[PDB]
Design an enzyme around this catalytic site. Structure first.
Site, PDB file in Angstrom:
ATOM      1  N   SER A  64       9.687 -30.280 -47.810  1.00  0.00           N
ATOM      2  CA  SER A  64       8.421 -29.754 -48.309  1.00  0.00           C
ATOM      3  C   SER A  64       8.111 -30.490 -49.637  1.00  0.00           C
ATOM      4  O   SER A  64       8.319 -31.690 -49.717  1.00  0.00           O
ATOM      5  CB  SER A  64       8.527 -28.235 -48.431  1.00  0.00           C
ATOM      6  OG  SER A  64       7.255 -27.636 -48.336  1.00  0.00           O
TER       7      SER A  64
ATOM      8  N   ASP B 184       4.597 -29.923 -37.504  1.00  0.00           N
ATOM      9  CA  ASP B 184       4.660 -29.450 -38.870  1.00  0.00           C
ATOM     10  C   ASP B 184       3.236 -29.405 -39.416  1.00  0.00           C
ATOM     11  O   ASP B 184       2.508 -30.391 -39.344  1.00  0.00           O
ATOM     12  CB  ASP B 184       5.530 -30.383 -39.706  1.00  0.00           C
ATOM     13  CG  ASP B 184       5.615 -29.976 -41.149  1.00  0.00           C
ATOM     14  OD1 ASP B 184       5.238 -28.844 -41.476  1.00  0.00           O
ATOM     15  OD2 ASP B 184       6.074 -30.812 -41.968  1.00  0.00           O
TER      16      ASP B 184
END
Ligand SMILES: *[C@@H]1O[C@H](CO)[C@@H](O[C@@H]2O[C@H](CO)[C@@H](OC3O[C@H](CO[C@H]4O[C@H](CO[C@H]5O[C@H](CO)[C@@H](O)[C@H](O)[C@@H]5O)[C@@H](O)[C@H](O[C@H]5O[C@H](CO)[C@@H](O)[C@H](O)[C@@H]5O[C@H]5O[C@H](CO)[C@@H](O)[C@H](O)[C@@H]5O)[C@@H]4O)[C@@H](O)[C@H](O[C@H]4O[C@H](CO)[C@@H](O)[C@H](O)[C@@H]4O[C@H]4O[C@H](CO)[C@@H](O)[C@H](O)[C@@H]4O[C@H]4O[C@H](CO)[C@@H](O)[C@H](O)[C@@H]4O)[C@@H]3O)[C@H](O)[C@H]2NC(C)=O)[C@H](O)[C@H]1NC(C)=O
Ligand SMILES: *[C@@H]1O[C@H](CO)[C@@H](O[C@H]2O[C@H](CO)[C@@H](O[C@H]3O[C@H](CO)[C@@H](O)[C@H](O)[C@@H]3O)[C@H](O)[C@H]2NC(C)=O)[C@H](O)[C@H]1NC(C)=O
Ligand SMILES: *[C@@H]1O[C@H](CO)[C@@H](O[C@H]2O[C@H](CO)[C@@H](O)[C@H](O)[C@H]2NC(C)=O)[C@H](O)[C@H]1NC(C)=O
Ligand SMILES: *[C@@H]1O[C@H](CO)[C@@H](O[C@H]2O[C@H](CO)[C@@H](O)[C@H](O)[C@H]2NC(C)=O)[C@H](O)[C@H]1NC(C)=O
Ligand SMILES: *[C@@H]1O[C@H](CO)[C@@H](O)[C@H](O)[C@H]1NC(C)=O
Ligand SMILES: *[C@@H]1O[C@H](CO)[C@@H](O)[C@H](O)[C@H]1NC(C)=O
Ligand SMILES: *[C@@H]1O[C@H](CO)[C@@H](O)[C@H](O)[C@H]1NC(C)=O
Length: 485
Positions: free
Chosen positions: A138, A417
């Protein structure tokens, strides 16, 4: 021996040492450590207090597995301005001026060279005399990539999973992988509902708009775009999936939209149920299963059926005015968005492109909130108010174009994602998704979500993930062995 906590005296401003230091919390484990001169794995949770992240020191996570495979120590470092690692107790536009990407990068390199480790106080375990591998997912994954790009020469190797390395203003493509990954029937129906919400917002009577808001239990929400802004709560749950979450909140959402119960014998095909049913089902799912205790979960309110937290137009809302380090909304991350600026605004797609989120949820809906979070204080304001923009960050970092000349950096991305299309494997990246090379490997996990390779639960649940993990571990192990060759 084995495990511990300590404080490191981190430089406030890496460009002006004389401005002094602040205390930054880190944790360590020697559980798999081979002794002085052995490797070290370093990881920060990123945009959050490090409390409850002790798991990243163990082989239940990819960080611990790396350590285990290379006989290394593992260090978890709390990112500056979060938890017990903030140089200021009050966070506004002036005090936040040292919460920048540049600072965060130099923290890492400076820590790796400087820290006096309790487990080896001869410098034999520091980055000068031992190979340090920086790992992250992330934002922390991006920080990892950005460090190799901006400040090479300290870390031996880097692994960035699900890293949003490209700053993007109108990040409508957040939702695109969800749309690709979702069931056909849910995708279609959610789309129908999102578009209908746009239609009523723009071309409906006051009664039609009031009524539509009532369906969701949001009759009392003043601004129609605040109402539209709740619909993404459905798709947003995709981000909570991994391969060990099973029948998760997300899949409950889709089932609710399609109008069936868990384990139903009879389900609709890929055609779905159409607008009338879908809207009813979507509205009721939100009203009955999401609204209850939603605002109360921020702490600033207590009524079960409160709609106060949905008001993005009230400048006095505690969401904006709570300047404390422990604030409920993570204004620290909002700072990065408005100031750096990353933006990453999660929007409905442009006219002519199919969307699963209303177009009324726009870049502008989000950008409007920046000055509410960060009102000018002693002449200091958020970066993007002085016309800093996406290009500003990307010119300097390289964005998804930092890939030209990299050294011992491996990437992982998830097929579905939500953060994919801000990273190196974006379908919208000029030249296409980054092609894997031996120098700079990239793997895309099939059916993958956000940072699906970080959890060893996913390794045992899924063959795709196991494959990817085996490869990247073997790659880190080969690179690490090279250091001693
Ligand atoms: C049209 O619209 C439909 C309605 O919305 C839509 O339907 C659904 O589709 C979604 C999308 O796939 C389904 O999702 C998931 O469901 C899986 C679980 O299924 C079962 O359980 C649910 C819920 O029920 C039970 O549990 C609750 C409490 O939790 C209890 O109350 C209850 O008693 C139940 O026990 C249930 O709905 C399912 O039901 C149906 O299927 C069974 C057969 O198993 C039938 O008997 C029954 O009639 C239902 O089926 C019917 O619908 C299908 C179509 O879906 C028809 O073909 C059929 O004829 C019937 O009409 C099941 O009982 C869940 O495992 C899925 O999650 C996994 O994958 C996700 C995504 O990758 C992962 O995030 C997640 O971690 C998990 O992963 C794992 O499994 C992967 C393998 O798929 C694997 O790759 C991965 O590594 C991981 O695996 C490993 O872990 C596993 C343990 O978790 C383990 O088994 C494995 O060995 C590994 O160790 C996902 O959440 C949803 O269930 C459907 N809902 C329905 C049918 O009600 C439909 O898709 C749309 N169609 C189109 C074309 O668009
Ligand atoms: C959609 O959201 C509405 C709020 O926007 C929900 O509502 C209401 O919720 C409860 C339940 O009906 C009402 O309350 C009462 O609950 C107790 C239970 O014992 C009663 O004794 C007492 O009369 C309470 O007043 C709320 O007053 C009501 N709030 C509002 C603002 O209308 C509604 O339930 C929800 N719909 C679904 C299907 O979940
Ligand atoms: C993950 O780490 C644990 C703890 O280090 C490993 O655990 C154990 O396994 C060792 C190697 O077989 C044993 O020698 C230890 O006695 C045992 N330790 C404890 C505390 O139970 C575990 O094997 C690792 N997992 C994998 C898959 O290698
Ligand atoms: C805007 O937000 C403020 C701050 O939360 C709201 O404030 C107050 O209103 C509450 C609801 O009645 C009171 O109980 C609080 O005591 C009060 N707090 C403060 C600091 O003023 C305010 O109502 C909101 N305004 C609108 C129009 O929604
Ligand atoms: C380093 O650690 C050992 C542990 O016993 C200690 O004896 C020694 O004094 C330490 N040296 C320095 C310079 O801190
Ligand atoms: C609203 O009306 C305009 C003008 O008729 C039309 O072009 C547009 O498609 C409508 N907008 C939405 C969001 O439905
Ligand atoms: C890539 O970067 C390395 C290290 O900075 C440098 O020595 C090398 O010459 C560069 N190669 C190219 C092709 O730019």
């Amino acid at each position: 021996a084995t495990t511990g906590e300590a404080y490191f005296e981190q430089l406030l401003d890496h460009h002006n040492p004389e401005k002094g230091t602040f205390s930054q919390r880190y944790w360590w484990s020697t559980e798999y450590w081979g002794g002085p001169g052995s490797p070290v794995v370093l990881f920060t949770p990123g945009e959050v207090s490090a409390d409850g992240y002790e798991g990243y020191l163990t082989n239940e996570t990819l960080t611990g597995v790396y350590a285990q495979e290379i006989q290394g120590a593992v260090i978890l470092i709390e990112h500056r301005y979060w938890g017990d690692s903030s140089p200021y107790e009050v966070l506004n536009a002036e005090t936040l001026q040292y919460l920048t990407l540049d600072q965060a990068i130099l923290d890492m390199t400076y820590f790796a060279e400087t820290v006096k480790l309790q487990f080896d106080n001869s410098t034999r375990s520091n980055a000068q005399n031992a190979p340090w591998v920086m790992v992250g997912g992330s934002y922390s994954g991006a920080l990892t990539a950005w460090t190799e790009s901006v400040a090479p020469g300290t870390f031996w190797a880097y692994h960035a999973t699900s890293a949003p390395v490209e700053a993007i203003y109108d990040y409508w493509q957040y939702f695109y992988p969800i749309q690709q990954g979702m069931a056909q029937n849910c995708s279609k129906d959610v789309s129908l509902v999102a578009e209908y919400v746009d239609k009523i917002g723009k071309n409906g009577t006051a009664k039609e708009q009031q009524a539509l808001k009532e369906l969701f239990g949001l009759g009392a929400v003043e601004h129609f775009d605040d109402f539209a802004a709740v619909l993404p709560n459905g798709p947003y749950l995709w981000q909570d999936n991994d391969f060990a979450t099973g029948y998760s909140s997300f899949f409950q959402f889709c089932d609710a939209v399609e109008g069936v119960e868990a384990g139903a014998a009879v389900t609709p095909g890929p055609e779905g149920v159409g607008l009338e049913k879908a809207l009813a089902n979507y509205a009721n799912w939100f009203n009955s299963t999401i609204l209850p205790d939603y605002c109360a979960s921020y702490g600033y309110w207590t009524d079960e059926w409160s709609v106060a937290c949905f008001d993005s137009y009230n400048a006095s809302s505690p969401i904006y005015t709570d300047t404390s380090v422990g604030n409920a909304v993570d204004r620290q991350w909002e700072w990065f968005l408005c100031n750096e600026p990353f933006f990453y605004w999660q929007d409905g797609a442009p006219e002519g492109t199919s969307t699963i989120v209303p177009r009324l949820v726009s870049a502008s809906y989000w950008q409007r909130q920046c000055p509410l979070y960060f009102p000018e204080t002693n002449g200091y304001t958020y970066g993007s108010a002085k016309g800093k923009n996406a290009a500003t960050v990307n010119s300097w970092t390289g964005g998804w174009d930092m890939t030209r000349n990299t050294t011992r950096l491996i990437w992982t991305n998830g097929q579905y994602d939500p953060w994919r299309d801000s990273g190196v494997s974006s379908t919208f990246r000029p030249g296409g998704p980054l092609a894997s090379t031996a120098n700079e490997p990239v793997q895309i996990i099939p059916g993958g979500f956000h940072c699906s390779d970080l959890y060893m639960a996913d390794y045992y649940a899924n063959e795709g993930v196991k494959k990817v993990v085996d490869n990247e571990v073997k790659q880190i192990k080969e690179w690490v062995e090279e250091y001693y060759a």
